[PDB]
Write an enzyme that holds these catalytic residues in place. Structure first.
Site, PDB file in Angstrom:
ATOM      1  CD  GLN A 152       9.187 -31.001  -2.029  1.00  0.00           C
ATOM      2  OE1 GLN A 152       9.514 -30.626  -0.908  1.00  0.00           O
ATOM      3  NE2 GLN A 152       8.949 -30.157  -3.025  1.00  0.00           N
ATOM      4  CD  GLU A 215      42.154 -27.913  -9.116  1.00  0.00           C
ATOM      5  OE1 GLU A 215      41.019 -27.517  -8.774  1.00  0.00           O
ATOM      6  OE2 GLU A 215      42.655 -28.973  -8.692  1.00  0.00           O
ATOM      7  CG  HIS A 352      18.451 -26.151 -14.618  1.00  0.00           C
ATOM      8  ND1 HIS A 352      17.852 -25.204 -13.811  1.00  0.00           N
ATOM      9  CD2 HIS A 352      18.529 -25.589 -15.848  1.00  0.00           C
ATOM     10  CE1 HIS A 352      17.582 -24.123 -14.519  1.00  0.00           C
ATOM     11  NE2 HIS A 352      17.983 -24.330 -15.760  1.00  0.00           N
ATOM     12  CG  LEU A 377      14.545 -33.234  -5.763  1.00  0.00           C
ATOM     13  CD1 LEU A 377      13.613 -34.300  -6.286  1.00  0.00           C
ATOM     14  CD2 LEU A 377      14.936 -32.276  -6.884  1.00  0.00           C
TER      15      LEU A 377
END
Length: 377
Positions: A152, A215, A352, A377
């Site tokens: 990560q 908009e 998401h 992440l």
RNA sequence: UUACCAUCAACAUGGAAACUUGGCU
RNA sequence: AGCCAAGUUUCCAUGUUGAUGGUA
């Protein structure tokens, strides 16, 4: 079975896993490209003291099998251990002089997650690593957790771990997602991700705060124009085809999307000159139960699988259906949190998660420079 | 908050009918 | 009566805080 997703790394080629998440393999093989970790720091509390130091030499051990010469980090210990302590720790002793930071905290809730995501991703661009001291506090289990954590930081720094071979060169993939939260007055945030190379390693993420949807069309045209000029600056070409995803919105607004966004998606995107009509494709993506397609991609060990429903709401690409189904198997790119694959394609959960951090409590916008890497992440 | 989760307990929205006060009109 | 509310009762799916097991 459908043809798999062969993955390639530096001087290595690894097939898809039998469990379909290539976990053990990437626990024992190289990386395509990895930003070198030279000057970095960890901050700890003495309650995890030994499990602090047993962690850091861990970062000098597992990574040379992954092909990343990680160096010794910097010790930090400060007394106070609240959300405001996180705030003063992330607004004062945080600067681009460091590469990215590792934090151990005993136990916490979603509010300090919102605090670290607010103060690591908005003003000072540094996507630091936050890992709790509850899941590593036992011995002989820190193996896989620390290896995933190492992946990560090696992903969320500008590095790019895996990639999929792309027959559709000079073509990008765009994910647009909407968060359905009504706690903060129903702000209804929108997350946008766009890839900036045919190999799909680099991407481009954005999010603005607005409630209304009039908009919204003009501002996402401006954002997609920024995405296309960024893709042109990285690529020096033009993508003929464009694929646009969904998150899981049911049939309550699918007709609304097809009547509002789909004709507006062809409206004023021809600003680049003359006669360059771009082929476009918009697909609705469902989980629970131009053609519809169910996908089996994620292998379940506990419980029954949830095959993923795909509803192509709009298409101008002319993509071959065999190429379309092989791509839709491969459309779960990246997802550097979880090595391997999931049920749903990558930019859906990508934006998401982006929508999750901005719409939890982050009533702001992420930085434009935090687009090339994968900070969220 | 290492990710992915399988299930449970509770909660906001979305309803579906029943029932009480009823107002109506 | 009908509709209109004030509603409640349970179900009732979606989202969503915790926990029970976990794949590492």
């Amino acid at each position: 079975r459908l043809p798999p997703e062969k993955i390639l790394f530096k001087h290595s080629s690894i097939v898809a896993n039998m469990e379909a998440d290539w976990s053990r393999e990437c626990l024992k093989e190289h990386v395509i490209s990895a930003v070198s970790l030279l000057d970095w720091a960890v901050l700890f509390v003495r309650k995890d003291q030994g499990k602090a130091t047993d962690f850091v030499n861990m970062l000098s051990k597992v990574c040379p099998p992954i092909g990343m010469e990680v160096h010794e980090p910097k010790m930090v210990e400060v007394v106070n251990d609240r959300t405001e302590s996180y705030l003063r720790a992330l607004r004062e002793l945080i600067a681009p002089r460091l590469q990215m930071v590792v934090i151990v905290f005993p136990t916490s809730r979603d509010d300090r997650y919102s605090a670290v995501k607010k103060l690591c991703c908005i003003e000072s661009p540094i996507p630091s690593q936050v890992l709790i001291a509850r899941t590593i506090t036992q011995q002989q289990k820190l193996r896989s957790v620390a290896q995933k954590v190492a992946l990560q930081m090696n992903a969320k720094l500008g590095g790019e771990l895996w990639a999929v071979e792309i027959p559709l060169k000079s073509c990008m993939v765009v994910g647009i997602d909407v968060y359905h939260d009504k706690s903060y007055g129903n702000k209804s945030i929108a997350g946008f991700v766009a890839s900036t190379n045919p190999s799909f390693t680099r991407w481009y993420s954005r999010t603005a705060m607005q409630e209304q949807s009039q908009e919204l069309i003009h501002e996402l045209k401006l954002c997609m124009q920024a995405a296309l000029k960024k893709y042109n600056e990285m690529n020096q070409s033009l993508p003929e085809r464009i694929i646009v995803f969904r998150d899981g919105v049911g049939e309550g607004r699918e007709e609304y999307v097809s009547e509002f966004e789909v004709p507006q998606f062809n409206s004023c995107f021809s600003i680049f000159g003359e006669n360059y009509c771009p082929k476009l494709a918009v697909v609705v993506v469902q989980k629970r139960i131009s053609y519809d397609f169910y996908l089996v991609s994620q292998h379940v060990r506990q419980g029954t699988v949830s095959p993923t429903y795909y509803r192509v709401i709009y298409d101008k690409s002319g993509l071959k259906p065999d190429h379309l189904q092989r791509l839709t198997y491969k459309l779960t790119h990246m997802y550097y949190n979880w090595p391997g694959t999931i049920r749903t394609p990558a930019p859906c959960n990508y934006a998401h998660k982006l929508a999750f951090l901005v719409g939890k409590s982050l009533h702001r916008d992420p930085a434009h420079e935090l687009s090339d890497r994968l900070f969220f992440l």
